[PDB]
Design a protein around this ligand. Structure first.
Ligand SMILES: Cc1ccncc1NC(=O)Cc1cccc(Cl)c1
Ligand SMILES: Cc1ccncc1NC(=O)Cc1cccc(Cl)c1
Lengths: 304, 304
């Protein structure tokens, strides 16, 4: 019993964190096999960030200008290349701590753990969601760039995110491990708009199922609804429209609790229209959307 | 910018997790140097838990009855002893992954990271507080017993908690690494009362300081208060009385923000008396008490 915002154990990722220095800028890199991945803005100075020509900037750099340090040992850089917004530094040594891994581009609404790092050293781990507007509400300071987001399936680490930038609104933006930004963001010191962000409806419903399982049932009512009626309410409250695909992934939780998905939707509809009236659900006074249906199943069954 | 419920990187602790089996019961153990620590209830059957005589139960067991498995390799048990509510299994091999460590008994209101484990395998990491009533609101299932709570200071892991029991109210109880329970709990299948739990006032004030630093300032008002006036309000709302010691630890945050501690108390007083009026602070619709003043300083400065 109990429900927590749980992150994956960060050990396999800690063994991959390195510090990358280029000139005066230092940030985090990910050392997998004989390649170090880091944000390409490591090659910029503060003046460059206003409007960087990354190709021209990288041309003034050689293998010896990239200082890669793993813990306390220096790695020899024998190759460098830019792929989208990431730099790939070929080193002469394969990381002995390289776990089984994959690079994956996650979908908005999906969750992942973040290992926040400074100077190649891990400082903390937290669980977050990729917002529908492709931003993350992380906790990152200067020096955190290159910190990564991941998921773990038994022994395989699926890297999904690399931190690049804090928008003027305090929210965060980054790339997949191929250097493609999630969202319309560019790695430039210019005001950039994150779109209107919506609440991840399917995740809120999954979290209401987690609440029923853990004993918080006060919100369950004698009502039901339809996908069309519920979506009229979701639209009014800036919730993502619920589709049959979302209903299908809620199936295991609906089977476990015996509460049909559309019945849970009617509870959510009443919570949206009436608020919580000063009550809490799973220790929260608001509707939580950072737990996918898979996260609820994993946590509620103890998957290691 | 941004403020998250961040846990310590769990890597140094993952390398210590083992599975301990005794008869038909399996739970988690902590392998440090040549000793495996686990809850003593590993020696009980379901029938024993109603009223166990642990000394009599342990006498029927020999070194060979304790099956300790680290990952996939078996450890040879050469000694066994009971210290309070923990079993200490001497193994013939020192854990090569033993980090620098200490055993510490934490105070109520202090925070720590938990590495939830099943069959000696880590499944998740979350940050929590030891409640003033010595319980923790964790996320633990059957098989999680022996999962540990810790803090990390540079390279030293301070182990502070071992999970033993879920109370009939869904809250959790456990021991320090010397087997002493936090609270009045006994490792027995009997209804046990956790006292009245209060909100950790100093942690809420530290979190309001984290809010001001990150931009959420709407709650700041034109008022001030005294320790005695504030404590009258704290008493009414079941908040821990604030002492000069608490004011002293809030000093660094007060210096950083330029908001005197008693001015922050007046904001908290108005929030307690008026609620949030539908607003949020750091993405929360309630007053958060799981961040100590040290956690706010560490997170807001990027301590690795
Ligand atoms: C200071 C900080 C805080 C949190 N995360 C990240 C940062 N750093 C930056 O955003 C630096 C920067 C500036 C313009 C473009 C890019 Cl790609 C990166
Ligand atoms: C089932 C479960 C869920 C979460 N944490 C722990 C558990 N397990 C137990 O509480 C088992 C037990 C029973 C009576 C006394 C003691 Cl010390 C331990």
């Amino acid at each position: 019993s109990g429900f927590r915002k749980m992150a994956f154990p960060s050990g396999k990722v800690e063994g991959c964190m390195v510090q990358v220095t280029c000139g005066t800028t230092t940030l985090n890199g990910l050392w997998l096999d004989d390649v170090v991945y880091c944000p390409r803005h490591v090659i910029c100075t503060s003046e460059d960030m206003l409007n960087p020509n990354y190709e021209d900037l990288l041309i003034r750099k050689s293998n010896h200008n990239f200082l890669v340090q793993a813990g306390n040992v220096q790695l020899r850089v024998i190759g460098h290349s830019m792929q989208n917004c990431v730099l790939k530094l070929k080193v002469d040594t394969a990381n002995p701590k390289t776990p089984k891994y994959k690079f994956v581009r996650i979908q908005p609404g999906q969750t992942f753990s973040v290992l926040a790092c400074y100077n190649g050293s891990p400082s903390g781990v937290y669980q977050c969601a990729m917002r529908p507007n492709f931003t993350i509400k992380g906790s990152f300071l200067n020096g955190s760039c290159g910190s990564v987001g991941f998921n773990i399936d038994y022994d395989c680490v699926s890297f999904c995110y690399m931190h690049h930038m804090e928008l003027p609104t305090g929210v965060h933006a980054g790339t997949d491990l191929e250097g493609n930004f999630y969202g319309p963001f560019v790695d430039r010191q210019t005001a950039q708009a994150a779109g209107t962000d919506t609440t991840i409806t399917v995740n809120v419903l999954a979290w209401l199922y987690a609440a029923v399982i853990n004993g918080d049932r006060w919100f369950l009512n004698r009502f039901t609804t339809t996908l069309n009626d519920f979506n009229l309410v979701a639209m009014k409250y800036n919730y993502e429209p619920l589709t049959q695909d979302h209903v299908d992934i809620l199936g295991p939780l609906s089977a476990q609790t015996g509460i049909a998905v559309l019945d849970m939707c009617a509870s959510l509809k009443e919570l949206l229209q009436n608020g919580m009236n000063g009550r809490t659900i799973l220790g929260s006074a608001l509707l939580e959307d950072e737990f996918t249906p898979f996260d609820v199943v994993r946590q509620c069954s103890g998957v290691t």
